[PDB]
Amino acid sequence: SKLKPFFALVRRTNPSYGKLAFALALSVVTTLVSLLIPLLTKQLVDGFSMSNLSGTQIGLIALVFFVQAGLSAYATYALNYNGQKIISGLRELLWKKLIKLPVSYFDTNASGETVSRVTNDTMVVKELITTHISGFITGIISVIGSLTILFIMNWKLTLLVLVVVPLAALILVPIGRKMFSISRETQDETARFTGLLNQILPEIRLVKASNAEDVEYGRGKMGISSLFKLGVREAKVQSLVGPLISLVLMAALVAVIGYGGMQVSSGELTAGALVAFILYLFQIIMPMGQITTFFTQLQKSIGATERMIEILAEEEEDTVTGKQIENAHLPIQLDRVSFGYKPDQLILKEVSAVIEAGKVTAIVGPSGGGKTTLFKLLERFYSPTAGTIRLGDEPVDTYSLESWREHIGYVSQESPLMSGTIRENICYGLERDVTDAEIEKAAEMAYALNFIKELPNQFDTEVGERGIMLSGGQRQRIAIARALLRNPSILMLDAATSSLDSQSEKSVQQALEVLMEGRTTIVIAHRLSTVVDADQLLFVEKGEITGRGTHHELMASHGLYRDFAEQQLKMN
């Protein structure tokens, strides 16, 4: 029942059954050959009365060994290659999914955790498919066949003590678990002592100033004393565990091998059966560890499969809603919009406002209100539930989200880079039009070519994977140019201002003003430099829009009491 999701997930990479089954069957045949090699060794041992059959037997054993090696090599290659294909398919599906999950999943959930889930679960599934399933089948077949052949060869007298010995291993195992428990306790004590030292050392200035060094010495001494005490206990336990484990192991070996030798001396049914018995001993010892690893990694793999299944269940739409974009130039109105992240909290209550077309509008919000939520709502990262963010009769209820994102430009505060070259930064506007070869020419219009005129290169100019050799202001200028290059119709600004300084603010703002005066602009930032360039101003407070109109006189009056209190808080 639990294996059904795993089988379905493997089935997502459908053309992977025949070769995997063939590889598993060939691994089974290779395993059955390892059960025949000791029999040939026994025949060779028993046939040394004449020296001709001996050499023939070494030849035959060498040939069988080479055949087994070749078959095992082919089976391992097939298994590993099929597992790699399955992992490639799984990673492709996961990445295609994820680059398309709504931004809400990432914001309200976990960024690095998703990457860790994908990377670890794919590798665990690989380890299960290529090694652990085939390993378990091989181990079970090897153990059963070796036990059966030993039972046929020797009646039971030595096989019975062979199966009794795992009871000695069974009493041995709790001792090893106690070893791990004591070791973990000692490690925890060592970590506590290290934490205490890392507590003390940074404030050595305070330690010296109070002149209480000896006090800290004694404290440290107490810590090491505790460590020593635990060490003494682990010394007693290791003195009890170590030699005893050795003793039991040797007692098993002496019992088994010695008994075989005894049956050799009495004249019983084993000499070459004794040699094959030792070989079967090794072929029984190895697969037990293989099966245990199989079970552990099977538990890990069912967990990983459930995680990958829950990741592969998310949904989203890009153009499913409709296709009705013709102009994208209408006044934007808010109509009783009340929805945040979860319907229970209601982090937004009937927010409504009137914004014209081709009019710069500024948004002023508090430190903890609904300015970020309104930013994401106006950028259409959340789906409306009760209210309507309405352009255009809600053919903003029947056009495509992809088309709306096409007609909007977005740089917020950092927008550092999509690392690579500047070519990608200007070819992210390659929307089937391909901008022919006018991209750098756009930089000429967007005041970017002259700024980049130092020209390390134009295509080999590498910002690096890290992207640290260029600062924020130049990159924000590049994003402004990208917005001007993509589809300069609607602009949505959080007004990225970092290390640009007053001289650059005016440069980039006058460039954007000349390029986008006839088109709609939206600003959401903090300062009062965009608001003066904004024809209409708004204000967000307690998840509600409170304030409409022009900037100068209204903000001089509206911002007199409560917005002024908020400001006086802000400088403080």
Contact between 535 and a copy of itself by CB under 8 A: the answer reads no
**Exposure class string for 219-237: b at 16+ Cβ within 10 A, else e:** eeeebeeeeeebeeebeeb
Q: Select the residue interacting with a copy of itself from 103, 320, 354, 434 (CB under 8 A).
A: 103
In whole angstroms, give the CA distance from residue 518 to residue 500: 26
Tokens matching residue 303: 């967990």
Tokens linked to 483: 């917005």
Residue closer to a copy of itself (CB basis): 8 or 191: 191
Nearer to a copy of itself, 3 or 247 (CB): 247
164 lies in the binding site for a copy of itself (CB under 8 A): no
Q: Closest CB to a copy of itself among 70 and 546?
A: 70
What is the rounded distance in angstroms from the CA atom of residue 244 to the CA atom of residue 195?
35
Structure tokens at 45: 């041992």
Which of 473, 558 has the CB closer to a copy of itself?
473
**Could you tell me which stretch among 306-314, 423-431, 438-446, 550-558 binds a copy of itself (CB under 8 A)?**
423-431
Number of residues that bind a copy of itself (CB under 8 A): 126
For a copy of itself, the closer CB: 170 or 209: 209
Interface with a copy of itself (CB under 8 A), residue from 156, 184, 208, 336: 208
H or E segment and range at residue 110: none
Task: Please give the residues from 52 up to 71 whose contact with a copy of itself meets the rule CB under 8 A.
Answer: 54, 61, 65-66, 68-70
Q: How far apart are CA 497 and CA 477, in angstroms?
A: 10
Q: How far is the CB of 133 from a copy of itself (least distance, A)?
A: 16
Helix (H) / strand (E) containing 563? helix 562-571
In the complex, minimum distance from the CB of residue 543 to a copy of itself, in angstroms, rounded to a whole number? 21
The residue (of 409 and 543) whose beta carbon lies closer to a copy of itself is 409
The continuous run of DSSP H or E covering 76 comes out as helix 51-98
Q: Least distance from C-beta 92 to a copy of itself, angstroms?
A: 6
Q: By rule CB under 8 A, what string of x and - marks binding of each residue 438-477 to a copy of itself? A: ---------------------------x------------
Distance from the first to the final alpha carbon of the chain? 62
Site for a copy of itself in 178-197 (CB under 8 A): 190, 193-197
Q: Could you give the CA distance from residue 374 to residue 89 in angstroms, rounded to a whole number?
A: 39
**3-class state of residue 360 by DSSP:** strand
In this structure, the number of other CB atoms found within 10 A of the CB of residue 143 comes to 19
State in angstroms the smallest separation of the CB of 176 from a copy of itself: 16
Minimum Å gap between C-beta 73 and a copy of itself is 5
Question: DSSP of 139-190, one letter per residue?
Answer: HHHHHHHHHHHHHHHS-SHHHHHHHHHHHHHHHHHHHHHHHHHHHHHHHHHH
**111 lines the binding site for a copy of itself (CB under 8 A):** yes
Q: Is residue 321 part of the contact set for a copy of itself (CB under 8 A)? A: no
Nearer to a copy of itself, 87 or 540 (CB): 87
Of these, 84, 148, 471, 546, which contacts a copy of itself (CB under 8 A)? Answer: 84
The only residue of 60, 169, 212, 357 in contact with a copy of itself, by rule CB under 8 A: 212
> Is position 176 an interface residue for a copy of itself (rule: CB under 8 A)?
no
Secondary structure letter of residue 361 according to DSSP = E
351-355, strands of its sheet edge to edge: 351-355, 332-337, 388-390
- Beta-carbon neighbour count of residue 198 at 10 Å? 9
- 494-523 positions binding a copy of itself, by CB under 8 A: none
What is the spatial distance between Cα 228 and Cα 301, in angstroms, rounded to a whole number?
Answer: 41
Rounded to the nearest whole angstrom, what is the least distance from the CB of residue 276 to a copy of itself in the complex?
Answer: 9
* 213 is a contact residue toward a copy of itself (CB under 8 A): yes
Long-range contacts of 159-167 (CB under 8 A, 24+ apart): 161/255, 161/256, 161/259, 162/256, 162/281, 162/284, 165/252, 165/255, 165/256
Query: Closest separation between CB of residue 567 and a copy of itself, Å?
Result: 16
Q: Under the criterion CB under 8 A, does residue 25 sit at the interface with a copy of itself?
A: no
- The residues, any chain, with a CB within 8 Å of residue 529's CB and separated by 6 or more, are 505, 509
CB of 322 to a copy of itself, least distance (A): 17
Would you count residue 1 as binding a copy of itself (CB under 8 A)? no
| Residue in the structure block whose two tokens are 């538990």 | 299
**Binding-site member from 13, 16, 80, 293 for a copy of itself (CB under 8 A):** 80
| Segment interacting with a copy of itself, rule: CB under 8 A, options 146-154, 161-169, 199-207, 306-314 | 199-207
| Shortest distance in whole angstroms from residue 354 CB to a copy of itself | 25
What is the footprint of a copy of itself within residues 256-285 (CB under 8 A)? 257-258, 260-262, 264-266, 271-272, 274-275, 278-279, 282
Q: How would you class 172 by CB atoms within 10 Å of its CB: exposed for 0-12, middle for 13-18, buried for 19 or more?
A: middle
Which amino acid, residue 290? Q
Q: How many CB atoms lie within 10 A of CB 115?
A: 11
**AA letter at 3:** L
Each residue 477-496 as x (binds a copy of itself by CB under 8 A) or -, in order, gives -----x---x----------
DSSP letters of 484-541?
HHH-TTEEEE----SS-HHHHHHHHHHHHHHHSSSSEEEE--SSSSTTTT-SEEEEEE
- Say if residues 193 and 225 touch (Cβ distance below 8 Å): no
Q: How is residue 382 written in tokens?
A: 């959340």
- H or E element in which residue 549 lies: none
Does 410 engage in binding with a copy of itself (CB under 8 A)?
A: yes
- The correct pick among 167, 170, 171, 209 for binding a copy of itself (CB under 8 A) is 209
Residue range at the interface with a copy of itself (CB under 8 A); choices 9-17, 42-50, 336-344, 469-477? 42-50
Judged by CB under 8 A, which of 24, 168, 200, 309 binds a copy of itself?
Answer: 200
Asked if 228 is part of the footprint of a copy of itself (rule: CB under 8 A), the reply reads yes
Contact pattern for a copy of itself over residues 365 through 404, marking x by CB under 8 A? --------------x-x--------------------x--
| Cα dihedral 137, 139, 143, 148 in deg (nearest 10) | 30
